[PDB]
């Protein structure tokens, strides 16, 4: 088998200062004991990358490689040339959270792009075998790199549905036209809730999404005063929490994924007098990641185009375009 | 030959006439509608919603109003004359989607006794539908059976919460509040198989009263500071209690919110998110929960249910004064019409 016994450099987009991304040479990673070297084909930009880029992220400082939405090809060893998409969350397998099958809550949970783990905004990453899912030949690595953002919302929806105190699952309202919102919308339709409305103020993304949206797309005003069995706040501001509160039917589900900001917004009185199940969600179980990949690859989660690509060398420029709010697509995929 | 009230004069009721004004006066006897019973009230508990209305804080409860919704008593007239009953005060339609779903506590046209248009049970008599009445066996005092409604509130929350949890880890529970809603949560948790229950109450007089018959741990907030529990129950429902329940809930655990203190913040939203806490606000009880509560009360699964002191209805105004002045060691006063 071909090996990397000696290494040189690889290209990476490194976060060097607030709103500053430099495309430069960094050392190629050394795989640990039971780890594979992944040549990154596609790595998507996430709300956590944006948050760390604007200097808002407390835990992600200094020089740092961001990005945790990676798909690519194993280099060297008996799985050389194998096409895989990466689960970036590494879990201890032995804490109470893991043993009940809620590894998303592991006490020592690490993600790629979260020190001490470098991010996937680079030509190569080192990853344990158990964090890799094989991508069939008929699925582009560019669609497979959506595994992680889809898996966040898939986890929310599965856990939410299973947590509901009744079987009345007719209506869902997803708040936010970002990647989280779309993932929630397509997860809700794949998991058997057909009547899904996504609500988004931005006319541009409404048109983008309406291309191949199997679910209803609307503006806040077209759903004013309506109530739904299920609400998904994919944005997570006070305003969006307030909106989700008002739009959840009595006995209904309010899923809170987005991490916008604020410590309020929930109508405590409505949630008590109308008995609303409110569930905050974090990432996904390893089994959710695998289920998500399975549902993508067999076509249950729609066309998965809601993407535009850019070279890693143009990463910085791509961040500016999201900031200025001029990306019609809800996801930018970088190409090392 | 069944006894009847074909003619009626007045009865005694304790009437909310204005802010902090309770007037023990003559009011009309209620005339039961078609499929309803007249109940002569033996025992009626004072709730937080009564004190809220008495202080002028309730927009839905102005004018002259008879408060109270925690009643037990005797059927008067007809074939059930003399039957001891405890009253489910929440009247539900039985045919709306919530009712058909089995969640009749969320009935779209739900009415509760003490919320207009339905007069409360702070009176010698109430009129209630037969489906809202649970028979009390002679070995259960009406003073203990009048706890059914406040115990059904927490029993319902506990059952809903346990059923809704995302994992089968129910080892430990914190109850915040040594009021009736808190004591009811602690006993309901133990009867539903969470053995390890800690109730937290800052007031020493209340803790001491609760220690008479506590099968759960009674403690100060400081004695549990920094600990996390599978299950937290906010039986108070201020911002401070919502914060304390947020902090004390373990990742993936359950935070039940029952209290109606006030405020619309306190919940640590970013921890509920990052640590995936299931947060459930709860309202009253299903008709089935109320029946289930009564059954467990009557067979002794919910402890001695002796955590009450009683006052004649004629002294209701003094009783309200005592509660307001933090003068009441017991977590429940039962008024005696
Ligand atoms: Zn992501
Ligand atoms: Zn673990
Ligand atoms: Zn009550
Ligand atoms: Zn109904
Ligand atoms: Zn007194």
Residue numbers in the entry:
A (entry chain D): -9 to -8, -6 to 327
B (entry chain A): -10 to -8, -6 to 327
Sentences from the paper on this structure:
Dihydroxypropanesulfonate (DHPS), a globally abundant organosulfur compound, serves as an ecologically important currency for nutrient and energy transfer from phytoplankton to bacteria in the ocean. A novel chiral-selective DHPS catabolic pathway was identified in marine Roseobacteraceae strains, where HpsO and HpsP dehydrogenases at the gateway to DHPS catabolism act specifically on R-DHPS and S-DHPS, respectively. R-DHPS is also a substrate for the dehydrogenase HpsN. All three dehydrogenases generate stable hydrogen bonds between the chirality-center hydroxyls of DHPS and highly conserved residues, and HpsP also form coordinate–covalent bonds between the chirality-center hydroxyls and Zn2+, which determines the mechanistic basis of strict stereoselectivity.
We solved the structure of DsHpsP from D. shibae DFL 12, which shared a substantial amino acid sequence identity (68%) with RpHpsP from R. pomeroyi DSS-3 and also possesses enantioselectivity for S-DHPS. The crystal structure of DsHpsP showed that four monomers, each containing two Zn2+ ions, constituted a tetramer in the asymmetric unit. DsHpsP is a member of the medium-chain alcohol dehydrogenases/reductase (MDR) superfamily, with a Rossmann-like fold domain for co-factor binding and a catalytic domain harboring essential catalytic residues and a metal atom. Loop 1 and loop 2 exhibited a rather constricted channel in the ligand-free state, but displayed an “open” state, with movement apart, upon binding of NAD+ and S-DHPS, suggesting a gating function for these loops in ligand entry. In the “open” state, the C3-OH of S-DHPS formed hydrogen-bonding interactions with His59, Glu60 and Glu139, as well as coordinate bonds with Zn2+. ICP-MS analysis revealed the presence of Zn2+ and Mn2+ in the protein. These results indicated that metals play an essential role in DsHpsP’s catalytic function. Site-directed mutagenesis suggested that His59 functions as the catalytic residue, as mutant His59Ala completely abolished the catalytic activity for S-DHPS. Glu60Ala and Glu139Ala displayed weak catalytic activities for S-DHPS, implying that Glu60 and Glu139 probably play roles in binding S-DHPS. The chirality-center C2-OH of S-DHPS could form a hydrogen bond with Glu139 and a coordinate bond with Zn2+, and these interactions disappeared when R-DHPS was replaced with S-DHPS at the active pocket, due to steric hindrance caused by the reverse chiral direction of C2-OH in R-DHPS. Moreover, the essential residues His59, Glu60, and Glu139 of DsHpsP from D. shibae DFL 12 were conserved in RpHpsP. Together, these suggest their common enzymatic functions and mechanisms, in which the interactions with C2-OH of S-DHPS determine the stereoselectivity of HpsP.
